[PDB]
Design an enzyme around this catalytic site. Structure first.
Site, PDB file in Angstrom:
ATOM      1  CG  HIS A 167      -6.873   2.593   2.445  1.00  0.00           C
ATOM      2  ND1 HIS A 167      -6.158   1.655   1.716  1.00  0.00           N
ATOM      3  CD2 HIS A 167      -6.544   2.369   3.726  1.00  0.00           C
ATOM      4  CE1 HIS A 167      -5.466   0.934   2.584  1.00  0.00           C
ATOM      5  NE2 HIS A 167      -5.669   1.308   3.810  1.00  0.00           N
ATOM      6  CG  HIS A 200      -5.146  -2.491  17.885  1.00  0.00           C
ATOM      7  ND1 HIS A 200      -5.263  -1.231  18.449  1.00  0.00           N
ATOM      8  CD2 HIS A 200      -4.485  -3.291  18.758  1.00  0.00           C
ATOM      9  CE1 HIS A 200      -4.682  -1.309  19.632  1.00  0.00           C
ATOM     10  NE2 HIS A 200      -4.193  -2.516  19.860  1.00  0.00           N
ATOM     11  CG  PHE A 210     -10.369  -1.524  15.762  1.00  0.00           C
ATOM     12  CD1 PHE A 210     -11.745  -1.378  15.877  1.00  0.00           C
ATOM     13  CD2 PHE A 210      -9.605  -0.757  16.590  1.00  0.00           C
ATOM     14  CE1 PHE A 210     -12.310  -0.519  16.793  1.00  0.00           C
ATOM     15  CE2 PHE A 210     -10.147   0.156  17.491  1.00  0.00           C
ATOM     16  CZ  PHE A 210     -11.489   0.227  17.618  1.00  0.00           C
ATOM     17  CG  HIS A 226      -7.210  -0.067   8.741  1.00  0.00           C
ATOM     18  ND1 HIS A 226      -5.952   0.035   9.291  1.00  0.00           N
ATOM     19  CD2 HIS A 226      -7.047   0.109   7.418  1.00  0.00           C
ATOM     20  CE1 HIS A 226      -5.085   0.273   8.319  1.00  0.00           C
ATOM     21  NE2 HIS A 226      -5.710   0.320   7.149  1.00  0.00           N
ATOM     22  CB  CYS A 227      -7.149   0.773  14.516  1.00  0.00           C
ATOM     23  SG  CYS A 227      -5.811   1.305  15.635  1.00  0.00           S
ATOM     24  CG  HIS A 228      -2.032   2.655  10.019  1.00  0.00           C
ATOM     25  ND1 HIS A 228      -0.875   1.896  10.007  1.00  0.00           N
ATOM     26  CD2 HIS A 228      -2.233   3.015   8.738  1.00  0.00           C
ATOM     27  CE1 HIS A 228      -0.455   1.828   8.752  1.00  0.00           C
ATOM     28  NE2 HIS A 228      -1.242   2.486   7.949  1.00  0.00           N
ATOM     29  CB  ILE A 229      -2.426  -0.157  16.426  1.00  0.00           C
ATOM     30  CG1 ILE A 229      -2.122   1.233  17.022  1.00  0.00           C
ATOM     31  CG2 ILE A 229      -1.732  -1.276  17.199  1.00  0.00           C
ATOM     32  CD1 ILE A 229      -2.743   1.534  18.377  1.00  0.00           C
ATOM     33  CG  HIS A 273      -5.068   5.253   7.112  1.00  0.00           C
ATOM     34  ND1 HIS A 273      -4.884   6.446   6.464  1.00  0.00           N
ATOM     35  CD2 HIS A 273      -4.735   4.303   6.171  1.00  0.00           C
ATOM     36  CE1 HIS A 273      -4.491   6.249   5.224  1.00  0.00           C
ATOM     37  NE2 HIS A 273      -4.381   4.922   4.969  1.00  0.00           N
ATOM     38  CG  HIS A 318      -2.568  -2.797   3.681  1.00  0.00           C
ATOM     39  ND1 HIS A 318      -3.457  -3.515   4.413  1.00  0.00           N
ATOM     40  CD2 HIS A 318      -2.915  -1.472   3.850  1.00  0.00           C
ATOM     41  CE1 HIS A 318      -4.279  -2.653   5.056  1.00  0.00           C
ATOM     42  NE2 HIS A 318      -3.984  -1.388   4.737  1.00  0.00           N
ATOM     43  CG  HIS A 360       2.342   0.197   5.085  1.00  0.00           C
ATOM     44  ND1 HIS A 360       1.265  -0.608   5.225  1.00  0.00           N
ATOM     45  CD2 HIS A 360       1.860   1.491   5.190  1.00  0.00           C
ATOM     46  CE1 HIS A 360       0.169   0.157   5.428  1.00  0.00           C
ATOM     47  NE2 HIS A 360       0.490   1.451   5.404  1.00  0.00           N
ATOM     48  CG  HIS A 371      -7.781   2.523  19.111  1.00  0.00           C
ATOM     49  ND1 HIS A 371      -7.114   1.293  19.107  1.00  0.00           N
ATOM     50  CD2 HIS A 371      -8.618   2.535  20.178  1.00  0.00           C
ATOM     51  CE1 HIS A 371      -7.551   0.646  20.175  1.00  0.00           C
ATOM     52  NE2 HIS A 371      -8.446   1.346  20.824  1.00  0.00           N
ATOM     53  CG  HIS A 421      -0.331   5.635   4.661  1.00  0.00           C
ATOM     54  ND1 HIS A 421      -0.870   4.832   5.652  1.00  0.00           N
ATOM     55  CD2 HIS A 421      -0.683   6.953   4.908  1.00  0.00           C
ATOM     56  CE1 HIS A 421      -1.557   5.687   6.467  1.00  0.00           C
ATOM     57  NE2 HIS A 421      -1.446   6.922   6.034  1.00  0.00           N
ATOM     58  CG  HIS A 467      -1.731   1.175   1.494  1.00  0.00           C
ATOM     59  ND1 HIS A 467      -2.596   1.690   0.545  1.00  0.00           N
ATOM     60  CD2 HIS A 467      -1.861   1.971   2.598  1.00  0.00           C
ATOM     61  CE1 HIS A 467      -3.208   2.764   1.102  1.00  0.00           C
ATOM     62  NE2 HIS A 467      -2.817   2.954   2.368  1.00  0.00           N
TER      63      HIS A 467
HETATM   64 CU   LIG Z   1      -6.054   0.429  17.613  1.00  0.00          CU
HETATM   65 CU   LIG Z   2      -0.541   2.981   6.013  1.00  0.00          CU
HETATM   66 CU   LIG Z   3      -3.647   4.086   3.510  1.00  0.00          CU
HETATM   67 CU   LIG Z   4      -4.966   0.276   5.330  1.00  0.00          CU
END
Ligand SMILES: [Cu+2]
Ligand SMILES: [Cu+2]
Ligand SMILES: [Cu+2]
Ligand SMILES: [Cu+2]
Ligand SMILES: *[C@@H]1O[C@H](CO)[C@@H](O[C@@H]2O[C@H](CO)[C@@H](O)[C@H](O)[C@H]2NC(C)=O)[C@H](O)[C@H]1NC(C)=O
Ligand SMILES: *[C@@H]1O[C@H](CO)[C@@H](O[C@@H]2O[C@H](CO)[C@@H](O)[C@H](O)[C@H]2NC(C)=O)[C@H](O)[C@H]1NC(C)=O
Length: 497
Positions: free
Chosen positions: A402, A458, A463, A452-455, A400, A112, A110, A397, A67, A65
């Site tokens: 897309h 998670h 998430f 989604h949460c980017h942790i 993010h 994905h 990164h 949290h 980002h 991905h």
């Molecule tokens: Cu999270």
């Molecule tokens: Cu990202």
């Molecule tokens: Cu993204």
């Molecule tokens: Cu994503």
């Protein structure tokens, strides 16, 4: 050197020791972080990703991905596995062929697929502006002014035991740092500046989890960009940066020639700076080659507060100036229990057929799309509001979206919304118990966009949801190349699906 906008990118396994402890990794370009991919605004990127992975302990499939890039008309190139594509299998390659109209700033790339980016597949992605409105604020902006902040684990991502707490073993600044336990005096990163010059520092969180309190002893930082969005100048002495966020700041090399500590304190893992953990070195040209002797203050005078940021351009806020003042106002119920996260009562589990392929094959309502309950339709050409009230364990949290950036109408730790001039960004902390962080955007980009949460731990625990924006126009708006159409058959054959 920077690569791109047209480049090969090989994904391989190798041993690395960024904190003095050797472990295998998943790397782009042979290094951690991966090489900087760069070009100019509006360029055509063609990143041909060669999957050469052989170690199953970190997964031999991959997907990448880009980002923060909107991917308008190229949803198939966005990268989230089982949302926009099937993974690339080992021994094969895939050309991510897209354009970046209307965007310029600091991004990253990164893996994905699963938690694979944690194993090393992460790097910076910069889109320069030849006519940057901030150009006169600095003298130097190049590969030497990028600062990455990363968490690093000794245990492999797929091998993190079910039921034990996950914390990192080191903070890496530009790929180097020291371990929290069994600390050895391994090399620290050095950022070099010349007395009297001004630098555009591009601060990128490539974290899988922690947020960092970032500061530079003796210096302050003037923010000029947030997640790709040019800002009015905001001078701060500390930045709390959440996973996947980016800032550009001007660093004025206006202190005595010397060595100064660069500090990045994560919210979990090692606390403090003993033995040089959580640290890098800012070195002026002509300084002695030795560690800094500087200290932090006890209390920072001017920490970043998100409501203090404002766009450079007149971006406004879409919709009407009150809660629910949007064509499609949503409030998500974000929860955690028993090891799994959920959104509106559904924990995300990736589907067998990627969401985009399900749409192109004729599934045209979101109730028809798998996973059931995880895909929500958004109407075209509409103002969307999404309230993200916090309280779920494991916070704060960083959510993010897309395909989009968004106005942050309400930020963490402040109950007052801003319908006039809030910052726009793409990853936002939803704060603490009782908060009601809220975002707005308009739907002018047909396709399935992950939220989604980017942790990453998670995300893996569910998430997430998919916003299927303008389902009816997705096929016409996103023509797909034959190589993309070949991904799912190749993946399903290799895995006997
Ligand atoms: Cu999270
Ligand atoms: Cu990202
Ligand atoms: Cu993204
Ligand atoms: Cu994503
Ligand atoms: C966060 O803000 C949203 C609106 O953006 C609030 O949503 C309302 O919730 C109540 C019940 O709690 C409903 O009766 C309304 O229909 C919702 N929409 C409105 C008023 O526009 C939500 O309650 C807020 N959450 C928190 C925790 O403050
Ligand atoms: C809490 O958030 C609000 C809204 O973003 C902030 O209020 C703004 O404050 C600025 C600076 O004084 C004023 O110019 C604006 O008119 C305010 N807007 C609104 C809608 O009230 C407020 O400053 C934040 N609180 C803190 C402590 O930072």
């Amino acid at each position: 050197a920077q690569i791109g906008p047209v480049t090969d990118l090989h994904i391989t396994n190798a041993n690395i020791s960024p904190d003095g402890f050797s472990r295998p990794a998943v790397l782009a370009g042979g290094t951690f972080p991966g090489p900087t991919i760069a070009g100019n605004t509006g360029d055509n990127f063609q990143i041909t990703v060669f999957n050469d992975l052989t170690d199953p302990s970190m997964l031999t499939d991959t997907s990448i991905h880009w980002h923060g890039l909107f991917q308008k008309g190229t949803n198939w190139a966005d990268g989230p596995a089982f949302v926009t594509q099937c993974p690339i299998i080992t021994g094969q390659s895939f050309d991510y062929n897209f354009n970046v109209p209307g965007q310029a700033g600091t991004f990253w790339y990164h893996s994905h697929l699963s938690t694979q980016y944690c194993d090393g597949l992460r790097g910076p992605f910069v889109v320069y502006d030849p006519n940057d409105p901030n150009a006169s604020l600095y003298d130097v902006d190049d590969d030497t002014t990028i600062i990455t902040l990363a968490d690093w684990y000794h245990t492999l991502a797929q091998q993190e035991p079910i039921g034990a707490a996950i914390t990192a073993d080191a903070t890496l600044i530009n790929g180097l740092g020291r371990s929290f336990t069994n600390t050895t005096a391994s090399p620290l990163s050095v950022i070099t500046v010349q007395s009297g010059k001004r630098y555009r520092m591009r601060l990128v969180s490539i974290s899988c989890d922690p947020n960092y309190l970032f500061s530079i002893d003796g210096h302050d930082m003037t923010i000029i960009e947030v997640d790709g969005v040019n800002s009015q100048q905001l001078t701060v002495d500390q930045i709390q940066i959440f996973a996947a966020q980016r800032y550009s700041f001007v660093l004025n090399a206006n202190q005595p020639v010397g060595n100064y500590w660069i500090r990045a304190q994560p919210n979990s893992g090692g606390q403090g700076f003993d033995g040089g953990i959580n640290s890098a070195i800012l070195r002026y040209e002509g300084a002695t080659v030795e560690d800094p002797t500087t200290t932090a203050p006890t209390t920072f005078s001017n920490p970043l507060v998100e409501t203090d940021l404002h766009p450079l351009a007149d971006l406004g806020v879409p919709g009407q100036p009150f809660r629910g003042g949007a064509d499609d106002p949503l409030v998500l119920n974000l929860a955690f229990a028993n090891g799994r996260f959920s959104i509106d009562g559904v924990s995300f589990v990736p589907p067998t057929v990627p969401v985009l392929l399900q749409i192109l094959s004729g599934a045209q309502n979101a109730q028809d799309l798998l996973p059931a309950g995880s895909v929500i339709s958004l109407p075209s050409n509409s103002v969307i509001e999404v309230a993200l009230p916090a309280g779920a364990a494991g916070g704060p949290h960083p959510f993010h979206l897309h395909g989009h950036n968004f106005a942050v109408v309400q930020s963490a730790n402040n109950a007052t919304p801003n319908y006039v001039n809030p910052i726009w960004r793409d990853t936002v902390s939803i704060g603490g118990t009782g908060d009601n962080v809220t975002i707005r955007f308009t739907t002018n980009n047909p396709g399935p966009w992950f939220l989604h949460c980017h942790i990453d731990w998670h995300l893996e625990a569910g998430f997430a949801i998919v916003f299927a924006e303008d389902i009816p126009d997705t096929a016409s708006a996103n023509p797909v190349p034959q190589a993309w159409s070949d991904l799912c058959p190749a993946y399903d054959q290799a895995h006997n699906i």
